[PDB]
Scaffold this motif. Sequence first.
Motif, PDB file in Angstrom:
ATOM      1  N   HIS A  81       0.876  -1.160   0.000  1.00  0.00           N
ATOM      2  CA  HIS A  81       0.000   0.000   0.000  1.00  0.00           C
ATOM      3  C   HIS A  81       0.916   1.213   0.000  1.00  0.00           C
ATOM      4  O   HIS A  81       1.658   1.424   0.966  1.00  0.00           O
ATOM      5  CB  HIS A  81      -1.012   0.010   1.156  1.00  0.00           C
ATOM      6  N   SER A  82       0.866   2.005  -1.078  1.00  0.00           N
ATOM      7  CA  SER A  82       1.798   3.098  -1.194  1.00  0.00           C
ATOM      8  C   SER A  82       1.577   4.218  -0.196  1.00  0.00           C
ATOM      9  O   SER A  82       2.511   4.953   0.151  1.00  0.00           O
ATOM     10  CB  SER A  82       1.849   3.608  -2.630  1.00  0.00           C
ATOM     11  N   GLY A  83       0.320   4.398   0.189  1.00  0.00           N
ATOM     12  CA  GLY A  83      -0.064   5.343   1.269  1.00  0.00           C
ATOM     13  C   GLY A  83      -0.797   4.565   2.326  1.00  0.00           C
ATOM     14  O   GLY A  83      -0.318   3.568   2.841  1.00  0.00           O
ATOM     15  N   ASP A  84      -1.983   5.045   2.685  1.00  0.00           N
ATOM     16  CA  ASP A  84      -2.854   4.347   3.618  1.00  0.00           C
ATOM     17  C   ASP A  84      -3.834   3.495   2.842  1.00  0.00           C
ATOM     18  O   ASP A  84      -4.268   3.893   1.759  1.00  0.00           O
ATOM     19  CB  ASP A  84      -3.645   5.367   4.466  1.00  0.00           C
ATOM     20  N   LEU A  85      -4.246   2.359   3.398  1.00  0.00           N
ATOM     21  CA  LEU A  85      -5.315   1.556   2.804  1.00  0.00           C
ATOM     22  C   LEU A  85      -5.954   0.735   3.884  1.00  0.00           C
ATOM     23  O   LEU A  85      -5.269   0.198   4.756  1.00  0.00           O
ATOM     24  CB  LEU A  85      -4.810   0.599   1.722  1.00  0.00           C
ATOM     25  N   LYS A  86      -7.285   0.624   3.855  1.00  0.00           N
ATOM     26  CA  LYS A  86      -8.018  -0.280   4.750  1.00  0.00           C
ATOM     27  C   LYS A  86      -9.176  -0.873   3.962  1.00  0.00           C
ATOM     28  O   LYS A  86      -9.724  -0.242   3.068  1.00  0.00           O
ATOM     29  CB  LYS A  86      -8.535   0.460   5.985  1.00  0.00           C
ATOM     30  N   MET A  87      -9.577  -2.075   4.344  1.00  0.00           N
ATOM     31  CA  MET A  87     -10.805  -2.658   3.839  1.00  0.00           C
ATOM     32  C   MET A  87     -11.995  -2.150   4.631  1.00  0.00           C
ATOM     33  O   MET A  87     -11.945  -2.178   5.865  1.00  0.00           O
ATOM     34  CB  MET A  87     -10.769  -4.161   3.947  1.00  0.00           C
ATOM     35  N   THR A  88     -13.040  -1.671   3.951  1.00  0.00           N
ATOM     36  CA  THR A  88     -14.253  -1.222   4.667  1.00  0.00           C
ATOM     37  C   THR A  88     -15.378  -2.211   4.581  1.00  0.00           C
ATOM     38  O   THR A  88     -16.238  -2.234   5.478  1.00  0.00           O
ATOM     39  CB  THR A  88     -14.705   0.143   4.189  1.00  0.00           C
ATOM     40  N   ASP A  89     -15.472  -2.965   3.497  1.00  0.00           N
ATOM     41  CA  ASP A  89     -16.639  -3.814   3.250  1.00  0.00           C
ATOM     42  C   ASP A  89     -16.251  -4.924   2.299  1.00  0.00           C
ATOM     43  O   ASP A  89     -15.354  -4.734   1.486  1.00  0.00           O
ATOM     44  CB  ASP A  89     -17.792  -3.024   2.552  1.00  0.00           C
TER      45      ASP A  89
END
Length: 100
Positions: A81-89
């Motif tokens: 992940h080059s910056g921020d990343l999260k799974m939401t759904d």
Amino acid sequence: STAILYPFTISGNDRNGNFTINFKGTPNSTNNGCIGYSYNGDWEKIEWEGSCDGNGNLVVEVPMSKIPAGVTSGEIQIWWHSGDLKMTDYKALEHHHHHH
Ligand SMILES: C[As](C)(=O)[O-]
């Protein structure tokens, strides 16, 4: 573990449609990961990749047909992940999941 982890369980039998995952992150970031699962004592991975759009959104679509019959659990993982990343759904089969 260097991966960001999101466990799931599924039907062992139903393989219609897509496994669709929503990620939220830095706009224009680049990202990859997998849908990983255990199958007969092996850890198998279906790779995904994509970039977040200008709204920070990335939708990944993996056909359910890529997961063998009989598999009932696994983990969605974020690798790069080059910056921020999260799974939401995610949505798979009849399950509509939100990650709080
Ligand atoms: C229906 As639910 C508890 O997986 O967001």
